[PDB]
Amino acid sequence: DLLELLMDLNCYTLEVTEGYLKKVNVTEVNGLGPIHVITTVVSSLVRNGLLIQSSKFISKVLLTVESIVMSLPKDETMLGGIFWLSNLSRLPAFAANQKTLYDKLTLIYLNDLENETLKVFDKIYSTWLVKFMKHASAHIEIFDMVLNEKLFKNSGDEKFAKLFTFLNEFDAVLCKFQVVDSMHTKIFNDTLKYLNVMLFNDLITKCPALNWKYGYEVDRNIERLVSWFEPRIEDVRPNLIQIIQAVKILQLKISNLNEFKLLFDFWYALNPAQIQAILLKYKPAGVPNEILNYLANVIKRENLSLPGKMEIMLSAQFDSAKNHLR
């Protein structure tokens, strides 16, 4: 009755996708379920050579997990995002391990399953992380903690304590829901890549006047923020390269276009409009016109040569989980 069960493509994928997953209310303990159910069905189907059925079943299941995740409510986003992503994150290595036991069309199917499952993972992961980090940055008040010069006179201490608790709690859930080590560290790098974007964009849009002192104080707040990550991941600062360079620029004492050219010609961490944006905001407690002028020309030169907009704002972008799913 097995193959006849497996041919009812519709019966059982309806079971998993409406009966089991759309209704997997997390807030509940162990004994990795969805990856077990998904993976049992896929491996039965592959063994019995139903390769097309597997593809369809896996498609519906991914589309389903995707909308579950995308539909999660503001207070469920952390737990839910992590539970689902931790489960999906195992599909690529499952495909790689399936193939270790295999004819040649099956090997090709599984090869494809591995790349395609990885691509869907990368899609859901990125959109979840930005949505997750939008909410967490408001709640933890990253702006007022780091960039708000009005609150430099404050210890900062309560807010920092709240950031450290949040990250300890982010870190527990990651361990709770069993995310693999190499993805745990990636999540923390991307978390910082996200705060690079938000912090740099807010430095430009939200911070009225800037000077060397301002720059020095943000630098310290950043080093405070980064102190949590440090016993945890490889090297956290490259993730925060734009916002770190912007506030370092603010502390340079540059007095001729000749020093400036030495510092920024053929230096691409920030573009010319980003660097100009930062220096037009400079107010003592200023920039030589000669420097303001050369930037203008540089910008104009680049408008004339290339077809694409030279964006001042950043967007969050993360690497593929390709090498991080061990």
Structure tokens at 70: 């995308």
Structure tokens at 259: 């020093």
> What angle separates helix 51-71 from helix 104-140, to the nearest 10 degrees?
0
Asked whether 146 and 110 are in contact (CB, 8 A), the reply is no
Structure tokens at 144: 């007022």
Asked whether 146 and 222 are in contact (CB, 8 A), the reply is yes
Resolution (A): 2.3
Q: Is 2 helix (H, G, I), strand (E, B) or coil?
A: helix
Breaks in the chain at C–N > 2.5 Å: after which residues?
Answer: 31, 102, 285
H-assigned helices in the chain: 2-7, 9-14, 33-47, 51-71, 77-88, 91-99, 104-140, 142-146, 157-176, 181-206, 212-229, 241-251, 257-264, 272-280, 289-305
Q: Which residue in this structure is represented by tokens 């964006």?
A: 311
H-assigned helices in 29-103: 33-47, 51-71, 77-88, 91-99
Torsional class of 79: left (φ above 0), alpha (ψ -120 to 50), beta (otherwise): alpha
Structure tokens at 299: 């910008």
Asked whether 38 and 61 are in contact (CB, 8 A), the reply is yes
Q: Is 282 helix (H, G, I), strand (E, B) or coil?
A: strand
Q: What are phi and psi of 231, to 5 degrees?
A: -70, 20
Closest CA to 247 of 225, 215, 280: 215
Task: Provide the 8-state DSSP code for 237.
Answer: G
Q: How was this structure determined?
A: X-ray
Residue 289: exposure state from Cβ atoms within 10 A (0-12, 13-18, ≥19):
exposed
Residue 226's contacts (CB-CB under 8 Å, 6 or more residues apart) are: 192, 236, 237, 240
